[PDB]
C-alpha cells in the first residue's frame, strides 16, 4: 500500500569498507512491494540510461527512510549520478555470466607500480558485484608512501546478448585468501569510447575563465564546507548567486562542474515542468523541494531560466504562476535557516527580464558576470579542446591557434565547438568524396577545413551592445604622431598614477573630446586603445540608444553607467554624439534633453568616478550644447585632420593584407602620393572597387593590377571640400 | 471524525504555577484521534522545521474549543512563537536520555546573584520540561528588592543521536525541597550561536527611527491597552494604519517587533497566496479570519503587499480578484464592532499605487511616513549594527563610522546590510587566499574591505526623488557680505516670527528668487544655508519633476508639497527653474502648462504655506513667465552676482587646502587679483586645470608653482560677456 514512486540517492556513511558496492538500503515494505528477493540483484532505472546499473541489494536497519537509497560513492561517480537525481527501482535482469579479461587503466597516474600493487586484485574483486565497465576507489593505505592512487577498469572483451543492457555485469572468481584471469595490470588506457560512458565534467574543460570561476568556487566553498566560521558571526549569510551573461558562454557546463565536484545534495529543476494547472500544486512542489533541501544539511539549489518561470511583475500580468510564487519562495528562504549550509544559484540569460524584486541586494547580493571570451580565453579554449581530442587525431601548430583566435573577434565560446565539428565534417567529406573512402587517420585535421568552417559558419553574434577586446595593432592603425603621443600620455597618467593623484587630491581629467573628418582616425582610435591598453572598453552608438518610447534612453544610460561602475575601471567611448547632443538647433524632443542632462549628471554631477575614463568622438562639434562643451569635462580637444602619407600607406597595407603586395608590384609609395587628399573610408572604397574591377576581368585573381586602382581613383571622387577643413580650423582657433 | 486542520497558540491563563510548561489544553477528541497517550509528549509541525518544542501533553476542561490551544508564555518566548500561529500536531519522540551540565545565562542582567539566588534550581527544575535552548520565567516574588530578573539555560553539552529534533529536550532529575550536576550558576553569556536559536527582535535593534517608531507605538497603544481613552468621547476608534515609504526601510522590522512585544494575537495574511481559482473561497476565508480576530479581544491584523492584492479600480479593470475583495473587507472592518480593540497595519511600497478608496478618512486616515535615513539616522543604524556585531569580531572607531555614513548619502538599510555582508565575504576570501585558511579573528574587519565593498556594491538607490547634499559650513563658504543680512532676514522671519505674523496678519510672503550668470554660487549659498540653518530640506531638480507619464509630475509635486507641509516649517529649493517656467517661448506640451498652473495655484492660490519658504534659482531671466513674475509671488529678487575680490580670495583658500601655500611662494592674493573676470566655478576649474598641468609636467609634486597657474590662466577664457550682465541689470531694475 506504500506504492513507492521515486527515490533519492545517498552516499554510504561510516566510510571504511562495509559492502561499498551493493548497500541498496531499502525499507522492507518496499522490498516486498517489488516482488523480488532482497538478497539478489536490483535495478535502478533513474528514468533513462538503459542497462539500469544491475547491482545486488541488501536490507536496512529500520533507520533508512523510504524516499532515500544508497548506491555507493563508486557507482554514483561511475554512472554519472549526481546527488538529487530522480531514481526509480524495478526488477533485476539475468545473472552475470562470467568475466574474461578485466584490466585496469591507472587513471591520472604514471602507472609502473609493481611493488605498490600488493595484490590489488583481492581488494578490487573481493567486493560483491563490481560491474566491469567502471570502478574507481580511494587510495586507502597501501604499503609505505601513502599518497593518492586511483585506477579505472574501462576496457572490455566479453560479449553480452542484450544490446539494451550495455552495462554487461560480470561475476568475480578468486583462488586464495586475505588468481583472476590472466593478470589485470596492463596499459594506461583512458575512458573507453566503445561504450560511450558519460565522462564526468571537470574544470579542465573550461579554460580562460579562471578568475571568476575561482571566485564562484570560493563563494560556494565558504558557506557549505566551513559553516562554523560564519556561525560565529551570524549575520544572515547570502543564499542567492547571480550567474548571467550572453547565451552560449557555458553557464550550464559550470553548473554541471560545480555539481560534480561537490558530493553534497543538489536540486535540478526542469523549469516549466513544475508549473501545474492546480493552484496549490506549485506551492506543494516548492515546499517539498525546500524541506528536502533542509532535511539533508548539505544542499545546493540550482535554478535556470528565471525570466521564464518568474517574469517581471510590471512588464506582464500573465497570471497563474506569477510573482506570487516569487513572494512565497522569498518568504520561505528568508526564514528557513539561520546559518545552515544552503546555496541557491540563479542562472538567467538577461537580468533585465527578471523581476527586479529578485535583484535585491539584501537577498541576492552575490553576482557573477560572464562575458564573451577574449583572444587569450579563446586561445585557451582551443588548446583545451585540442588536448581533449588528443594529438593522434590532428596535426596542428600553436601559431595557427593564435591566428584562429585573432580571426575570431565576436565569436562566442559556443561557436568554437560548432566550428570544430563542422571542420571535422568538411574534412570527412573532402576525404570520402575525393579518395573513395580512404583511411581517415592520415587526413586527421588541417587548416583548410577550419578556414572554410569560419567562412561558412555565419555566427549570429554580430549584433550586441558591448564588444569585448577588439583586435587591432599599431601596425594597422592610421593617425598622426601627436595624437598618438597625447593619447598615450593621458592613458598612462591615470592607470599609473592613480595613487599619486589621490595623494595630491587632483584625480584625473576623465574627459577627452575628439572631432575631425568622417574618414578615419576618430573611431578606429578607440579600438586601437582598447587593444593596446588591455582594459575593458565600452562603445556606444548614437542612433542605437534612440528609441520611439520616451525614457528608454534614460534607462539605457543608467544601465550602462552601472555596468561601467561594476565592471572595474574602464574607458567609455561614444561612436557619434552629434546625433543626440543638438537639442535646440535640431528641435529634438524631450528625450534628447533627458539624455543630455543624464550624461551631464553622470560625468561630473554630484558623483565622481576616478576609475572610468570618458572619451567621445564627433563629426560636427558646434551643435553640442555648451553645458557638455565646457572645460573640465571633455576639455581636451584634438584637431586630428585628414590622415597623412604614412597613415594612408598603413591603411592601404591593411586593406592589401588579403592580396599580395609583391605580386602587384606596387611599392606603396606611388599610390600614397596619388591618394593624398582622400579619406580612410574613401581609400577602402577605392580598394574595393579595384578588387571588383580585377575580379571582373578573368573571374578569380591572385593579385590586383595597378590599372584597376587607377581606374577606381579616376572614377570615384573624394567628396571632401576645403570648407569643412576651414570650419574645423576656425572652430579650433576659437577653442 | 473531527479531523482537526490547524491549531493556534494561546498564553496560559490564571497565572499561578500550574504547569506553565506543559499546559496543553487540547480537546480530548483530538488526543484520541492522534492515537497517543495524553500523559505523553507532543510536538507542533508549524509548517517545516519538524521537532519544535517537544513538550508533555495534558487535557482541558471541555471549554476551550478545538482551534485554540495553550503552550504557556514560557514556551511561547522560548520558541519565538507568534500568537495564533498555525500549528499541526505530530507524534511524540522517545524520552530524553539525561541532562549533562546545565548552566544558567542570566538574561538582561549583570549576573552575580549569590545571596538573592536562594536555590532557584528547585523551582527551575521542579516544573516539567526544562529544555536545553532556554526558558523564560517572570521574576515572581523573591525576598525584597522587587525588580525583574530572568535566567536562560543557553549553554549545555547534551548529546542526542537524532539530528531531526532541533530542540533536544532534556529530562529533569534534581534533589531539593520547597546533589545537582556540576552546578548551574555560572557565566552571563548570551544565547549560544552553535545551535543558532532564533533570537526575537527588539526595539533597540532598530536605530534612527525614534520619532516614527514612537508615533507607531502610541497609535497601537491607544486602541488596545486602554480603549477607554478613546471610547470616553464616543467617536469610534480608528482600525487601520497605513505604512509606506521607500522599499526596505523599516516595515518588516516594525511588524515583527510589534508582533513579538505584544501578547495579543497576531495574524499576517499571505497576500496573493490566499488567492485561488474559487472566487468565493478567499472571501469565505476572509470572514473566517475576521471572525477569529473578533472572537479574541486582543488581536493584531497584519496586511502586506496591499497594492498587489488591492490595486486601483480605475487603473486596471482585470477581473477575478478585484475591487469586490476591497468592498467586502471594507464592510467587514466597518461593522466588526463598536469600540473593540483591534489594530490593522498596512505596509505598502507605493501609497499612490493603492486604490484611493482605501485612503479614506473614515477607514485609513492614519498614515505613517518614513523617509530615507539622513546622515544622523544612517550613522545610528551603522553604530547599532556594529554594536550587534560586537567588538570581539571587529574593531571600528567612531570617525570611520561617521566617514562611512557621510559617504553613503543615498544608501538604504537593506543596502547597508548587504554591504556589510559582502564586506565580511570579501574579508574571508582575502584572508583565505593570502594566508591559507588562517584564523579570521586576528585579521578581523578593517577599512580596506569596507572601501572595496562600497566600490563594488553596485548601488541601485541613486534614482530617488529625495536627495541629501554634502554638509558645508560658512567657514568653508567664500562669498561677499552683500545681501547676507537680507537672506538672514528672509530665513529668520518665518521661523522666528510665526507668532508675530499670526498676530499682525503679515504672514509669510514665501517669495525668494535667485538669478545671475552660471557659477555665481547661488546653489552653493543655498546648500550652505540649508546645512547651517539645521532645517529640513527637499532636493528638487529641473528635469527631475518632469515625468514621461501624463499626470505623474502632478502627483510627484503634490507628494513633495505634502511632505514639505508635514515636515515642519522648512525650505524648498529648485535647482533649475528655467525649464518648467518657459511655456511660451518654445513649443511645450500641455503637461508643462498644467504643472505651471498647479504650482501657481499652490504657492498663493486658495491656500498659503506660511511655514515653508520657497526659494528658486534660474540661469536666464527670460524663461520665467510674467504670471509668476508678480508681486506677492517670488517678489524678492536676490542679485547674487559674481564673487567680489574678497569673495574670490576666500574661495582660493578652499581649493588650496590640499596643497601647501608656504613652499609655493605665492601670496595667494595676487593670483586672485589676476583672476577677476572669472566665477567661483571658473576658479575651481582653473585650480583643477593647474593641478592637472602640475601632475602632467613632472608627475608627483607636493605643490603647484606660479608657472602652472599662469599657464592655466592663459589657456582658459572667462567665457562671460558684459552684454548678458547688462541684460541682467536691466531686468533687475524693472523688478
Ligand atoms: N568557455 C567555453 N569553453 C569551451 N566550450 C564552450 C565554452 N562556452 C561554451 N562552450 C560550448 O558551448 C556549448 C555549451 O553551451 P551552454 O548551453 O552550456 O551555454 P550557456 O551560455 O550556459 O547557454 P544556454 O542558456 O543555452 O544553457 C558546448 O558546445 C561547449 O563546447
Ligand atoms: N535600519 C536598518 N538597520 C539595519 N538593517 C536594516 C535596516 N533597515 C533594513 N535593514 C536590512 O534590510 C532588510 C530588509 O529591510 P526591511 O525589513 O526594513 O524592509 P521592508 O520595507 O519591511 O521590506 P519589503 O522590501 O518587503 O517592503 C533587513 O532584514 C535588514 O537586513
Ligand atoms: N567658489 C566655489 N567653490 C566651490 N564650488 C563652487 C563655487 N562656486 C560654485 N561652485 C559649485 O558650482 C555649483 C553652482 O551651480 P550653478 O552653476 O549655479 O547651477 P545652475 O546651472 O542652475 O546655475 C554649486 O553646486 C557649487 O558646488
From Swiss-Prot, chains A, B:
- Binding of ATP 2: at which residues? 516-523
Gene Ontology process terms (BP): protein hexamerization; response to xenobiotic stimulus; ribosomal large subunit biogenesis
Q: What does this protein do?
A: ATP-dependent chaperone which uses the energy provided by ATP hydrolysis to generate mechanical force to disassemble protein complexes. Plays an essential role in the cytoplasmic maturation steps of pre-60S ribosomal particles by promoting the release of shuttling protein RLP24 from the pre-ribosomal particles. This step facilitates the subsequent release of other shuttling proteins such as NOG1 and allows the transition of the pre-ribosomal particles to later maturation forms that bind REI1. Essential for viability.
Record's GO cellular component terms: cytoplasm; preribosome, large subunit precursor
Keyword line: ATP-binding, Chaperone, Cytoplasm, Hydrolase, Nucleotide-binding, Repeat, Ribosome biogenesis
Swiss-Prot/TrEMBL domain comment:
The first ATP-binding region binds ATP with low affinity whereas the second ATP-binding region binds ATP with high affinity. ATP hydrolysis mediated by the second ATP binding region releases RLP24 from pre-60S ribosomal particles whereas the ATP hydrolysis mediated by the first ATP binding region is subsequently required for RLP24 dissociation from AFG2, probably by disassembling AFG2 into monomers.
Pfam families registered for this protein in UniProt: AAA (PF00004), AAA_lid_3 (PF17862)
Where in or outside the cell is it found? Cytoplasm
What's the protein name?
ATPase family gene 2 protein
Where are the coiled-coil regions?
none
Identify the residues that bind ATP 1. 245-252
Q: Which family does it belong to?
A: Belongs to the AAA ATPase family. AFG2 subfamily.
Q: So what does mutating residue 416 to S actually do?
A: In afg2-18, drg1-18 or drg1-ts; temperature sensitive mutant. At the restrictive temperature of 37 degrees Celsius, impaired growth. Severe loss of ATPase activity, homohexamer formation and 60S ribosomal subunit maturation
Q: State what changing residue 528 to V does.
A: In drg1-3; resistant to diazaborine-mediated growth inhibition
Q: Which reaction does it catalyse?
A: ATP + H2O = ADP + phosphate + H(+)
Question: Activity regulation here?
Answer: The hexamer is activated by RLP24 during pre-60S ribosomal particle maturation; RLP24 activates ATPase activity of both ATP-binding regions and increases cooperativity between AFG2 subunits. The second ATP-binding region is inhibited by diazaborine; the inhibition requires prior ATP binding specifically to the second ATP-binding region.
Mainly localized where? cytoplasm
State the Gene3D superfamilies in the record.
Answer: 1.10.8.60, P-loop containing nucleotide triphosphate hydrolases
